[PDB]
Amino acid sequence: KPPTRLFRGLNLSEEFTKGLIDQANAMIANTTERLFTDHSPEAFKQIKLNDLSKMSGRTNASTTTEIKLVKETWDSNVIFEMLDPDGLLHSKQVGTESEFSVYLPEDVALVPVKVTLDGKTQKGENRYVFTFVAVKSP
């Protein structure tokens, strides 16, 4: 019974973060609609191609169930929140008891659903949470 919510953080440049927000919101408003309603295989692949969270193909990406660890250890300005109700991520605990190793299969997409401002880093940067749901190929 793996965890269904996992966080991963990255420190990204000011300009890249702005471009990432626009890409995320663009996808949320265009592509994800076609996937959630029509279960469009075209929409699925386009979402996979974008790979917003830089996780595609990874077999042991580090994550944690506690967003606070991410903030305290790395002070990331961009945090990726993955909602995985179906256990599609093969979450493995790396006993640091909240740390889990994740594998994203090629037939699983991290579908963006929300971008939310979540305070600031110690550096005064806006911190953004990108929320995804892990979905199987239609």
UniProtKB/Swiss-Prot annotation:
Disruption phenotype: Cells lacking all four members of the SidE family (SdeA, SdeB, SdeC and SidE) show no intracellular growth defect in mouse bone marrow macrophages (BMM), but display attenuated growth inside the protozoan hosts A.castellanii and D.discoideum. This mutant no longer recruits the endoplasmic reticulum (ER) marker GFP-HDEL to its vacuoles, even at 10 hours post infection, and is unable to induce Rab33b ubiquitination during infection. It comes from the Bacteria. Is able to ubiquitinate itself, but this modification is not required to ubiquitinate Rab33b. NAD(+) binds at R8, G9, L10, N11, L12, S13, E14, E99. It is found in: Secreted; Host cell. Induction: Expression is induced during the transition from exponential to stationary phase. The modification 5-glutamyl glutamate is found at E97. Belongs to the SidE family. Secreted effector that interferes with the host cell ubiquitin pathway and is required for intracellular bacterial replication. Catalyzes the ubiquitination of several mammalian Rab proteins (Rab33b, Rab1, Rab6a and Rab30) during L.pneumophila infection, without engaging the standard cellular enzyme cascade (E1 and E2). Transfers an ADP-ribose moiety from NAD to the 'Arg-42' residue of ubiquitin in a reaction that releases nicotinamide. The modified ubiquitin is subsequently transferred to serine residues of the substrate protein via a phosphoribose linker that results in the release of AMP. Interacts with IcmS. Contains an N-terminal deubiquitinase domain (DUB). The DUB domain does not interfere with the ubiquitin conjugation activity catalyzed by the central domain of SdeA, which causes toxicity. This is Ubiquitinating/deubiquitinating enzyme SdeA.
